[PDB]
């Protein structure tokens, strides 16, 4: 069971899907969606 | 088994996620190196 839960939702280029993970870097991770270094959760992605 | 003997060198070249796997090697090996010294000094202290 989970304390409280936030689902974050957004769209990105498929190459940039590697940048969402905690500790990664690049043109979206540095500038508009950073996960914390010690994150817990799941990241889920599909082409649309 | 770390990439380097020098703590600053490990931090000069690796990111947070990868650096910790090298640093904790030096922490584990140096903490053994102290526990050997302190045990040996307690055994010397018991003779003195």
From Swiss-Prot, chain A:
It comes from the Viruses. Residues 13-15 are annotated as: Integrin-binding motif. Changing residue 15 to N: In strain: Omicron/BA.2, Omicron/BA.2.12.1, Omicron/BA.2.75, Omicron/BA.4, Omicron/BA.5, Omicron/BQ.1.1, Omicron/XBB.1.5, Omicron/EG.5.1; complete loss of interaction with host integrins. Binds to host ACE2. RBD also interacts with the N-linked glycan on 'Asn-90' of ACE2. Cleavage of S generates a polybasic C-terminal sequence on S1 that binds to host Neuropilin-1 (NRP1) and Neuropilin-2 (NRP2) receptors. Interacts with host integrin alpha-5/beta-1 (ITGA5:ITGB1) and with ACE2 in complex with integrin alpha-5/beta-1 (ITGA5:ITGB1). May interact via cytoplasmic c-terminus with M protein. May interact (via N-terminus) with host bilirubin and biliverdin, thereby preventing antibody binding to the SARS-CoV-2 spike NTD via an allosteric mechanism. Attaches the virion to the cell membrane by interacting with host receptor, initiating the infection. The major receptor is host ACE2. When S2/S2' has been cleaved, binding to the receptor triggers direct fusion at the cell membrane. When S2/S2' has not been cleaved, binding to the receptor results in internalization of the virus by endocytosis using host TFRC and GRM2 and leading to fusion of the virion membrane with the host endosomal membrane. Alternatively, may use NRP1/NRP2 and integrin as entry receptors. This is Spike protein S1. It comes from Severe acute respiratory syndrome coronavirus 2. The chain holds residues 391 to 438 of 1273 of the full protein.
């Amino acid at each position: 069971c989970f304390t409280n839960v936030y689902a974050d939702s957004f769209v990105i280029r498929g190459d940039e899907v590697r940048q969402i993970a905690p500790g990664q870097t690049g043109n979206i991770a540095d500038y508009n969606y950073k996960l914390p270094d010690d994150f817990t959760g799941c990241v889920i992605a599909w082409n649309s | 088994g770390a990439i380097s003997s020098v703590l600053n060198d490990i931090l000069s070249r690796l990111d947070k996620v990868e650096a910790e796997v090298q640093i904790d090697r030096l922490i584990t090996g140096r903490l053994q190196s102290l526990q050997t010294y302190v045990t040996q000094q307690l055994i010397r202290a018991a003779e003195i």
